[PDB]
Subunit: 334 residues, 4 copies
């Protein structure tokens, strides 16, 4: 029994719960969010503007969120050191607040009695993992780890296949990315990111991202070879990586597509998907892939210079990978 | 001769400044916003997703926002008691934070050296005014007043005409309303208003509003005769009042429309507008009216039961009224 | 078996197919759409921006659309008289083009060998039915019938309960309505509906509707007692009825809600739904109800004057009713 | 006087009229659109969801569109051969229907009595020009020409500066592009572009474009050195070029920015703009530039491998260029 708690009952926290409730080996013991009371947590979990109503019975009773008859404790602590993880029997904490992304903050959960923490974001200092790429490098002494970003989980599996087969010499990427909770409904204050304060649903908004650099951390051979940027656009979920790369070995576009298709059918099955259909972003709502290569959308300019397109449900694909990483950690430590 | 300061440099604060800079007798001395430094204030005023670039020169210099040569001091105080309104020579404070809407909160501005405060919102206890309806009832001894809500400013002039002519027995109102800064880009916490936390750009969102009942405060004879609710929809600005009203006297629709046209040409000129064109919400972006009657959109069922439709730029029409009420207070107080 | 064909493979045509595939008594023999070839029909049926991917295998094979092994003939006839319904063994035609909504056009399906036609829209000509309101008035001599509009299917069950219990004296309705295929992505020509040509996703757009007067056709006692209008807003599916009604018998809001709840649990089960939750439009994506009463959103101004709010998935609830009406017609004619 | 007519009174046709009415030497004699009657033409010209109301008097009288006293004949011919251009004294036709983009189609305007045609789109046939880049290659023996695409007009001035100063070895472009009139409000038939049939306001939609390869026609030294693709996103106007380019000569990003700033201040003034502000797409609504380099948004991977960002109001910048090309052609003609 993988006994877990969730800190930060937001987009990622609530969807990680949806995914986790479908895994036989996982018991979600408790969640913590100081802004969400038990009855409110039942409301937020049951109804979802992006991914539909939860197919199951959702209520609250006292301090319990009750889903299909399973009782989940709801705590409301601003300070993770005050969450009763150990007294509740929680061994793994999903750290999905966006607030405790460094080792020093995430360690508070272990102080509070958990054993291990998975940060659902890039971490400035916790080791980072992408399932399908380097989760095999996880060892049980690592108590606090990061599942990287949603963009890194799209880019890294694709870059892995391309680099393995043809070699990546250099690459620049853009993610055309759905809006998120950090943005504003109308022009408002965002002192740390002026563009990000502008009306989210009315603008294309250039943004920064460390996701391309981060690929060189989970694929050390690509260290320093990739960088990138983001354009936030008025869709509510699903994002797309636009990867422009110089290759070491010359290829045709068909050969590149065939290498990606082969990986998607074998070692990257369930992580890297493949399509030749006339897909659009809504076609990936609820997709569990980290990366779906759009074969028809990309374009080759030279035998060593190509643009590759790959989709990802930044909320739900990533949330699935959180749970996958959790189960790999529990299996590797058993 | 009117020396004002602006607290809360947001949608209303910044657009009130836009309007004020166009008024002879107004000198904007300072603004206060603890989240917006001077250089950031210049950026937020210059560029607007809804109302376009400020046609003028906007820069910052030290602690001054500089607009077409005029220097405006920028304070950053969370507590209005700490704002040097008096030392700066500010006589009037435009209270547009949404946080100090009661006499208790707005009085802090006077304790800080200002003389009078106009709250850009309904107030639980401050006297309320709607230009064109009851601003002549303002008396100079009133130091803290409210300019009501954008919705009240749309409904009250319309209701005043209908009541003055045919009489209003009772009326139920819906405002189909653009999203505002209190809403969320994706499903997030909103513990005082659960529907309002849901994805703003992807939902029709019911919301309570006292704006129809508040008409009874500015039109005492309509006390208890109007109420209603709101539906927030994914437009970024401009809203519409849908007033279903029972009349005391039998009328034809042509008769109602003529009465409204007469009012808009005479005593409510510039406040109540009138159109017979095939208008949609974007046609009122930047409109200075409080209320624009849409003659072709309404429908009569019986001679005493009719549905009336009136548009309003909830940001800019209201902001213009804020400045209009300020100039009336100053004049009445001379 | 109920052997059917679908004319017009659009939003309604394709969602009617989705519903019908879940009904054991129905065999979908064929579809016709001159603008959609077989492989394109497979794509349009498989991928849906609003209702997700079809959960099942969708391919095309020569002239057949193939869904979970069941083959469906695809015709491409502009003129319904040329569709080989009789030769194909089709007895019922779902007429969902929007082009053939009168008896004269719909009869061409019967000339072509079908037995009966259900028009998925109001008809100037053909008798109209709303399941849960008057489908037991269907008699087998009626060969061509209309399932009314999506708004009429939301308003009529609600009006039936309120009129049955308290009596409706008069009522005025607004539907705040999602955009549809007749609208335009940017300001474009719509010479019969000038407002309807303006940018659909950027505007609140007033529109005329006969849906409230049509209630008086399916509930004859309400003939002449209801009318209304529409406001199109930038959501892509789900709409809401805003009914302002004068009652004959006085009541509390709670008594009104209780009458609707009882109907929803009894004679209008599956047609009229009932909620007290903090719902928004996306919470009814895929709902099979015609009408979901929003208990917390309405408001009462006098014991005989109240505003009632009811939701509907204008695409999917209506499409479910089309199939329900079809099964009622087949059973009534056996 | 440059006497002109406009064929296709759409987004480009109407905005070309707005621009042309501000040029002293141009007389707009007539417009043609079989779907827009004279009074409807006045409505569509007067009200604009994207660019506001026309600041001027707009009426219709008989068969004339009347703008600030100037009468413009309104024709309604589906076949341009039937437009009485000659009898009306029109010398230059702006061909903005999207339907007559080849020499054979546009020639009908000359058979009907016009002298020269400017197609407001790429042509498979007609020589293409981009103002600021190659309009000095226009010669008056050319009777039918193309102003290329809005994306080519953004990319070409940028590529010219970069190629002139550092040399372009090769480049791959993505345009993140606002929706246009060819898209659909909900999933509908688009048999030649399946992705383009999907819900425009709810999807990121990949699309082909020859815009980058077309730069090689107006800058022949760049033939075969650029290509790219498009992602349509739910904004109603303004688009952005994302150019990933390999340089021949090593550069710092600062030298690149400085070269573009210099060109924007001299030989490309009014065509190529330059900004270092925290801009988003709405900040370029109504901009007359072909291309606005976003200095802060771009990123450098190596001294010869860089990503450059440039904005454009695809409707209004391009419409202004159509009028600029017209005046250049007329100066060289007659
Ligand atoms: N949304 C995405 O697409 C996405 C994808 C991958 C990763 N992430 C990352 O996951 C994290 C969460 O993202 P989100 O999109 O779910 O954000 P969110 O804002 O939806 O959720 C954050 C939650 O944290 C809660 N919270 C805030 N302070 C807290 C505290 N002190 N203790 C406990 N709970 C607290 C909030 O109430 C909220 O419910 C962020 O690091 C983000 O970068 C987001
Ligand atoms: N359409 C409208 O937006 C509209 C119309 C009429 C009235 N109003 C009302 O006007 C008020 C402001 O609304 P808004 O839409 O401009 O909101 P907003 O969020 O755009 O602006 C509020 C501003 O107040 C600032 N602020 C927050 N706390 C502060 C403090 N302690 N001291 C000083 N400044 C502070 C914020 O930083 C922000 O800039 C609200 O009461 C609102 O109900 C809004
Ligand atoms: N969308 C809704 O919410 C809704 C709800 C209730 C009723 N309706 C009604 O249903 C009908 C269709 O609506 P929709 O929204 O599905 O529209 P749609 O445009 O999505 O579908 C109409 C289909 O008819 C096809 N078609 C056109 N001409 C044809 C012909 N001559 N023969 C066969 N097929 C043809 C089109 O190619 C298209 O696929 C309309 O009458 C509409 O008013 C729509
Ligand atoms: N951003 C842009 O919208 C943009 C930018 C650059 C170029 N263009 C190009 O300009 C052209 C028009 O684009 P638009 O966006 O203005 O399209 P639009 O659909 O807004 O306008 C096209 C107009 O042509 C009219 N029309 C159709 N058939 C006709 C005929 N036979 N005779 C006369 N008029 C006819 C239509 O009624 C419509 O008003 C296209 O070639 C397009 O690719 C568009």
């Amino acid at each position: 029994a993988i006994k877990i708690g969730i800190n930060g009952f937001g987009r990622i926290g609530r969807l990680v719960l949806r995914v986790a409730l479908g895994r036989k080996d996982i018991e979600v013991v408790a969640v913590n969010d100081p802004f969400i009371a038990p009855d409110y947590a039942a409301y937020m979990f049951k109804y979802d503007s992006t991914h539909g109503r939860y197919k199951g019975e959702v209520t609250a009773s006292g301090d319990d969120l009750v889903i299909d008859g399973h009782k989940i404790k709801v705590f409301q602590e601003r300070d993770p050191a005050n969450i009763p993880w150990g007294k509740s029997g929680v061994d793994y904490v999903i750290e999905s607040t966006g607030v405790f992304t460094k080792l020093e903050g995430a360690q508070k959960h272990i102080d509070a009695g958990a054993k291990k923490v998975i940060i659902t974001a890039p971490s400035a200092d916790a080791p980072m993992f992408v399932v399908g790429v380097n989760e095999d490098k996880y060892t049980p002494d690592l108590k606090i780890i990061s599942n990287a970003s949603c963009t890194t989980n799209c880019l890294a599996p694709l870059a892995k296949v391309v680099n393995d087969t043809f070699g990546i010499e250099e690459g620049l990427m853009t993610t055309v990315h759905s809006i998120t909770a950090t943005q504003k409904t109308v022009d408002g204050p965002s002192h740390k990111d002026w563009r990000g304060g502008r009306t989210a649903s009315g603008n294309i908004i250039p943004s920064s991202t460390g996701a391309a650099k981060a690929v060189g951390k989970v694929i050390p051979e690509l260290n320093g070879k990739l960088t990138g940027m983001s354009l936030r656009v008025p869709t509510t979920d699903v994002s797309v990586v636009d990867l422009t790369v110089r290759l070491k070995k010359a290829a045709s576009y068909e050969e590149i597509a065939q290498a990606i298709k082969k990986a998607s059918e074998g070692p990257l099955k369930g992580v890297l998907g493949y399509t030749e259909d006339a897909v659009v972003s809504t076609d990936f709502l609820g997709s569990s892939y980290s990366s779906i290569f759009d074969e028809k959308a990309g374009i080759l300019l030279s035998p060593t210079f190509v643009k590759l397109i790959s989709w990802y449900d930044n909320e739900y694909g990533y949330s699935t990978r959180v749970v996958d990483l959790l189960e790999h950690v529990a299996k590797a430590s058993a």
